[PDB]
């Protein structure tokens, strides 16, 4: 399929990655710059990520899924429902909406495509109705994180696709804060797409300090892999 051929030739092997965040929650303004690689042939992603204006005021666990599904290892028998792929070079743009329950919202939008060589990850955050002293803006949150799956349906209307999914964020009380993720994409290009069957992608993350690291900061390092079309 020369559609699925252009897609396997941008990343068969190891990808370098640049992340950027613009953020406003509550009007506590903040960036983050990441710098990783991707290899999509294992579904594998490996990211640190960094602070550049101090100390982040929401927890880095929180933004985990902000900071690439086109890295995502889809099966041989699955390459034909990898939209994430199919829209590159010229890439996609994620929006979200994430509602934190009994708190405030982010709402995202960011634009993935490559730059020459390099994957880029462009984002901008507002969070807004978040309490002060909650879950969030109070940094309860533990510094790990659950395996969740991912479901992946296709938009048709908008050429493009809808993902809905919920994270569970593990508080320092032993309780969970709910995270009811909201996402559409939708290819940057005026070019056909894969436009795929219901599947879903799932997700493990591990999250690690660099040791030798004195900014606020985050390791993340992720697997992900295409099911759920047999």
């Known amino acids: 399929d020369p559609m699925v051929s252009k897609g396997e030739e941008l990343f068969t092997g190891v990808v370098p990655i640049l992340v950027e965040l613009d953020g406003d929650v509550n009007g506590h303004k903040f960036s983050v710059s990441g710098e990783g690689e991707g290899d999509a042939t294992y579904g594998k992603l490996t990211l640190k990520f960094i602070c550049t204006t101090g100390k982040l005021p929401v927890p880095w666990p929180t933004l985990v899924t902000t ?11 699955m390459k034909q429902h990898d939209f994430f792929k199919s829209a590159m070079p010229e890439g996609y743009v994620q929006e979200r909406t994430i509602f934190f329950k009994d708190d405030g ?28 002293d909650g879950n969030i803006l109070g940094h309860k949150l533990e510094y790990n994180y659950n395996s969740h799956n991912v479901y992946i349906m296709a938009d048709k209307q908008k050429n493009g696709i809808k993902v ?11 309780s969970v804060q709910l995270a009811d993720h909201y996402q559409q994409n939708t290819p940057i290009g005026d070019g056909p797409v894969l436009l795929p069957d219901n599947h879903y992608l799932s997700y493990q993350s591990a999250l690690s300090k660099d040791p030798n690291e004195k900014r606020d900061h985050m390791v993340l390092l992720e697997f992900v892999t295409a099911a759920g079309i047999t």
């Open 67 to 77: 900071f690439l599904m086109c890295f995502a290892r889809y099966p041989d028998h």
């Open 105 to 132: 919202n982010y709402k995202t939008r960011a634009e993935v495509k490559f730059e020459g060589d390099t994957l880029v990850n462009r984002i901008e955050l507002k969070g807004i109705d978040f309490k002060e």
């Open 164 to 174: 809905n999914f919920k994270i569970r964020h593990n508080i320092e009380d032993g």
